[PDB]
Amino acid sequence: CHLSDMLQQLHSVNASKPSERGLVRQEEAEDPACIPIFWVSKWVDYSDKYGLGYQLCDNSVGVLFNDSTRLILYNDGDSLQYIERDGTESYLTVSSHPNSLMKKITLLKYFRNYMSEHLLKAGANITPRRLPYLRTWFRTRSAIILHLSNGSVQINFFQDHTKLILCPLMAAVTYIDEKRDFRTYRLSLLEEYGCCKELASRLRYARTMVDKLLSS
């Protein structure tokens, strides 16, 4: 649904060959109303044994466990959301001490603590405009692809620390460049005004990744 929408929006921008305008006028495509509310600021791949832990930009943490269940810890440090393999959601607190979930809670706290001490925040200096969980993820040789339950797809490129945050609702893309500057564009407006070569090649790659998400 949202992925198929994202796929058309990307194809449409890419088919416009936006980096080949006489003069590119990217800035005209910026739309502050489209700035994403959530993105992944930190992640830890422990998929060999436990799963994938992550931090969202609000400092909440989540884990997609290998058993395909999900656990989210809100930034109050006590409130939890647990999502079953079947997708059923429920809310509870660490301090309630639920025997059945103590292992998963302890794993999540490990992830939170490790990210806190040993990783830096992506998008730490970003002007703000339902908290999502991680629906699926995968890695390629050059990027990690993160698909959130709100429809957003985030792609983090390894070689140069550049990132894209795509929203299919807003039909928008946020680009985090090598200098850590952030900008949010309306995709339809990049078609009209053009964009630089580096955003253009990344949006081509983004399309390939959205294809991958759809075939999987």
From Swiss-Prot:
- Region listing for Linker, in residue ranges: 122-130
Q: Where does the signal sequence lie? A: none
Q: Result of mutating W43F? A: Abolishes interaction with CDC25C and reduces centrosomal localization
Looking at the record's lineage, which domain of life comes first?
Eukaryota
Q: Which residues carry this modification: Phosphoserine?
A: S4, S79
Write down which residues bear the modification named Phosphothreonine: T127
User: Per the database record, which ranges form the POLO box domain?
Assistant: 39-117, 133-215
Give the induction note. Answer: By growth-stimulating agents.
Tissues and organs where the protein is expressed, per its UniProt entry: Placenta and colon.
Subcellular location, record wording: Nucleus; Chromosome, Centromere, Kinetochore; Cytoplasm, Cytoskeleton, Microtubule organizing center, Centrosome; Cytoplasm, Cytoskeleton, Spindle
Give the start-end ranges of region Important for interaction with phosphorylated proteins.
Answer: 161-163
| Cross-link annotation Glycyl lysine isopeptide (Lys-Gly) (interchain with G-Cter in ubiquitin), location | K121
What PTMs does it carry? Ubiquitinated by the anaphase promoting complex/cyclosome (APC/C) in anaphase and following DNA damage, leading to its degradation by the proteasome. Ubiquitination is mediated via its interaction with FZR1/CDH1. Ubiquitination and subsequent degradation prevents entry into mitosis and is essential to maintain an efficient G2 DNA damage checkpoint.
Function per UniProt: Serine/threonine-protein kinase that performs several important functions throughout M phase of the cell cycle, including the regulation of centrosome maturation and spindle assembly, the removal of cohesins from chromosome arms, the inactivation of anaphase-promoting complex/cyclosome (APC/C) inhibitors, and the regulation of mitotic exit and cytokinesis. Polo-like kinase proteins act by binding and phosphorylating proteins that are already phosphorylated on a specific motif recognized by the POLO box domains.
The domain-related comment in the record is:
The POLO box domains act as phosphopeptide-binding module that recognizes and binds serine-[phosphothreonine/phosphoserine]-(proline/X) motifs. PLK1 recognizes and binds docking proteins that are already phosphorylated on these motifs, and then phosphorylates them. PLK1 can also create its own docking sites by mediating phosphorylation of serine-[phosphothreonine/phosphoserine]-(proline/X) motifs subsequently recognized by the POLO box domains.
Record: disease: Defects in PLK1 are associated with some cancers, such as gastric, thyroid or B-cell lymphomas. Expression is cancer increased in tumor tissues with a poor prognosis, suggesting a role in malignant transformations and carcinogenesis.
Family listed:
Belongs to the protein kinase superfamily. Ser/Thr protein kinase family. CDC5/Polo subfamily.
Q: How does it assemble?
A: Interacts with CEP170. Interacts with EVI5. Interacts with FAM29A. Interacts with SLX4/BTBD12. Interacts with TTDN1. Interacts (via POLO-box domain) with the phosphorylated form of BUB1, CDC25C and CENPU. Interacts with KIF2A. Interacts with CYLD. Part of an astrin (SPAG5)-kinastrin (SKAP) complex containing KNSTRN, SPAG5, PLK1, DYNLL1 and SGO2. Interacts with BIRC6/bruce. Interacts with CDK1-phosphorylated FRY; this interaction occurs in mitotic cells, but not in interphase cells. FRY interaction facilitates AURKA-mediated PLK1 phosphorylation.
- Protein name, please? Serine/threonine-protein kinase PLK1
> Which lineage do the record's taxonomy fields give for this organism?
Eukaryota, Metazoa, Chordata, Craniata, Vertebrata
Q: Which residues of the full protein are shown?
A: 372 to 593 of 603
